[PDB]
Design a binder for this molecule. Sequence first.
Ligand SMILES: CO[C@@]1(C)C[C@@](C)(O)[C@H](O)[C@@H](/C=C\C(C)=C\C[C@H]2O[C@@H](C)[C@H](NC(=O)/C=C\[C@@H](C)OC(C)=O)C[C@@H]2C)O1
Ligand SMILES: [Zn+2]
Ligand SMILES: [Zn+2]
Ligand SMILES: [Zn+2]
Lengths: 81, 815, 66, 61
Amino acid sequence: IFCRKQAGVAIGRLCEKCDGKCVICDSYVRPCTLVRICDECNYGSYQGRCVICGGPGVSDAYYCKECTIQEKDRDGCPKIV
Amino acid sequence: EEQKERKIMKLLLKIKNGTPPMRKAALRQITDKAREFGAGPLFNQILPLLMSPTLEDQERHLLVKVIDRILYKLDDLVRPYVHKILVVIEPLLIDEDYYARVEGREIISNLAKAAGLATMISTMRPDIDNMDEYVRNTTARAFAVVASALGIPSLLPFLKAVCKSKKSWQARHTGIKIVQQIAILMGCAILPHLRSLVEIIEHGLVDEQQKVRTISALAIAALAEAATPYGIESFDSVLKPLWKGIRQHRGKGLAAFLKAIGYLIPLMDAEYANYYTREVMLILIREFQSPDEEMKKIVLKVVKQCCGTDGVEANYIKTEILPPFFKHFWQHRMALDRRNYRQLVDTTVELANKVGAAEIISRIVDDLKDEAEQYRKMVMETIEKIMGNLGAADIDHKLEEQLIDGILYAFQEQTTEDSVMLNGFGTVVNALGKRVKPYLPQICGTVLWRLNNKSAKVRQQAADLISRTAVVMKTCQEEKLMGHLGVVLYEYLGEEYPEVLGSILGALKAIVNVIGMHKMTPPIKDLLPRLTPILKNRHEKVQENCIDLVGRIADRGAEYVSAREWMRICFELLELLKAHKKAIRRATVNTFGYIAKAIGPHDVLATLLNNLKVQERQNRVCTTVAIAIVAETCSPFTVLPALMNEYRVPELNVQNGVLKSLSFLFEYIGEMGKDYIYAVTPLLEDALMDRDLVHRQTASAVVQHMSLGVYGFGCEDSLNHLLNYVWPNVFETSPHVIQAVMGALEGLRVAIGPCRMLQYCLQGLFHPARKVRDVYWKIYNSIYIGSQDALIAHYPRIYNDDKNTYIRYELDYIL
Amino acid sequence: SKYIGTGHADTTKWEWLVNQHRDSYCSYMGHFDLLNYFAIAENESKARVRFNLMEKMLQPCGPPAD
Amino acid sequence: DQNKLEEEMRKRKERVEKWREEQRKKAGKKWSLEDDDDDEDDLDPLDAYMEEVKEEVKKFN
Ligand SMILES: CO[C@@]1(C)C[C@@](C)(O)[C@H](O)[C@@H](/C=C\C(C)=C\C[C@H]2O[C@@H](C)[C@H](NC(=O)/C=C\[C@@H](C)OC(C)=O)C[C@@H]2C)O1
Ligand SMILES: [Zn+2]
Ligand SMILES: [Zn+2]
Ligand SMILES: [Zn+2]
């Protein structure tokens, strides 16, 4: 359900609904590392959209502290397909 | 059969309205099919579908990729059709859509790579001499794309030949336009070929035709813009003609030559930059009086470009440039001119960034009082930009007085609520700081008059101003009529407009967040009971500001309110933890922490346990969060005994609630849990020995959160002890239990280390039963994907057999 | 499954052992002080030890069964 | 207080207007660079190179 292709410079975004909860482990405590997404998931009309519900993005997506500790930020683009 | 291949190459519909897997499958198969299909039918059908009037964006992208792949394979068979393809795709290069242009350029690039240079030149040469100006532009852009694809030196001979043509001036014009489009398209990649292009195009500046001279000057400007901050010894044979032309030409050609001069000047040294500026400067001063509203924009751009270099110093600028600039450009005619207004503001700011803020600021600050408000907003914008970029070190008594009087008069003379005057007032007062003591009475009178009435759109702007200036307002030991303002803001607490109520609450909070409760004149005991009914309002700004205010009051003025009301307020705040705006939740967490720190953990904890016992799911989850907050603000040594005493109650769904609360507690406190792992270990043992699936699933969740919470703190003993009870659950078929067990194992991989996990997996990796092998290889792959490097030091020794060598001998070396 | 070095219920001893030999050689090439240790132990230049490890990378543990 | 605030405004406005009166007494063809449109007013090396190219294309065919 995850895109997981090696990413790049595009910054993942979150919608107003879930702003501030992890994209991997969907958690409500301590954000750590900025989310990067693949270029295909940010191409064209997809730029700036929510990495969970493809809707309008209002904030930067983050991996939680527990995910970065477990290096779950190094597994590829976390855009849900 | 002919339509044979057509019916089978409907693969492009297989792709167009098709699934991604069959998309790529048909892509690969049609790539293998292309050489045999032949370019004739393929293009005969695809170019109509690409010419479809309502095609989509990504359908177009996929079609372009199909073109790319079917063009790579069939290389030299595309020649007899090139012309046709071009007439379809020579448009899409002047299209107002950026991605259409990218796709057209990619198509033309792959076409030029498939075919040869001679073919492209032979098909594109007849339209070089065309009279329709619409064709000569697409032709130049396509030649630029071909040069970018096949390289510049491959096209250099054709260029050198075409702009020496004595046959017609149209061919020369189009060749110079090709050079200009090459520059525009390739940018800083033209630097190795700069001198070649310059010597190819340089003889056009002295042509007998005026259109050739203009296009040559535009091409020189394009090359100089692509080359910057390098490239200057390649622009040497153009310096003499360009300056002689700006000395002799007049009009459109003069504008082109001046644009060229302006793009060339920043590439020189101080000498040449200083010497050349003088010449073009006398010419530009003469041209300050010409008519077209294009000429003004070009002159402003050139002034900004030249005044930003080192060869030009502030003395010459203030002596020669500032008087005519401010005499000719600063009139309200410039203000109603929306085209060059921003250009004038930027040019003036960048002038002040070199000559000094004082002169600019004076010359326009006398103009802040004006009959037209457009000219007022322009001056205010420029002034606040200069102030933000430089600050206000050089404000004099006279200048300070004038500034204050001007901003005060501008504030009152305001028709519609604008952010311009608000931000100007704010930054001026914030930059002056402790220096504005008597204009503090004056400003307080002004904001009192604005906040008294007039539709609450002036009142909310006054409240914003108070919120942003209260720091410097109190910074000078003046609060008193500070209290006079707070009284009026209090009276303005019943408002039908929530937007104005938000600003009122913000201003009140900014006041009290710097006004001591002793001397905060409205007695805290009276305010707070007036404040508690506002907590049930449903506007987000009102709610956030009310919660923040109650939090400040509970943090500092806790003594005045009799408790019980604090308990009611916290029990009401309990429901805001589920708010669907992070802000509301953040402020609620803060305020709950303050109230808990104020009234003490005992009573609130008793109430929270009672509330956790009797309510529905979401309220119980919020109660769990609240218990974790109380235990973090007041050390968990005050919460843990009362919470563990509740586990001694004999009922199911009661122990599971205690376990869920412990799970979230450890996840929420993180590092603080290092002192409390020994206390909860026997309870987790009991729960891990519990038959109920939820009891073991929740105990595994607790183990995971506890493991990831303490890491680097030396708690490995209890975690190994608990792993001894978690591990037997690996043979569980229930999905939720096994999910929690995997989570706990991956947390222990971090807290306990991969060596222990490998030691637990070794004997099962090669078990005779396939179930054991599946489970153990899943666990092992999870251990291997994380920390693959550490495992190098942990693998056990495996002896050589007759066929193969398995000992790692390097690690047996002994220095 | 897409990661090289992972196993499954049908993995044999030979595949496991060649996988750990191969990533052992890569770890030796990576870490600067392990290669120092080996080059001092067998009295060779470090470039020679690196080339020997790369040459051993191809068929560690001998050719497979049957 | 409101009456005093209204007075203060009246006086400031009057002072500004008097100062203004004091000062006052003391005292397009359209052409775009995005077009080739000129305002009013109105052997070969290209064929040789073209001939060289045409020769290459004919030879390949
Ligand atoms: C119904 O919509 C869903 C389910 C899906 C969604 C992503 O679309 C939507 O945005 C999302 C938003 C609302 C909810 C309910 C989700 C997240 C929030 O939930 C709340 C119910 C929790 N409550 C707590 O966190 C407990 C304590 C507080 C104060 O926090 C903290 C950090 O102490 C956890 C979380 C903060 O919920
Ligand atoms: Zn992606
Ligand atoms: Zn979303
Ligand atoms: Zn996470």
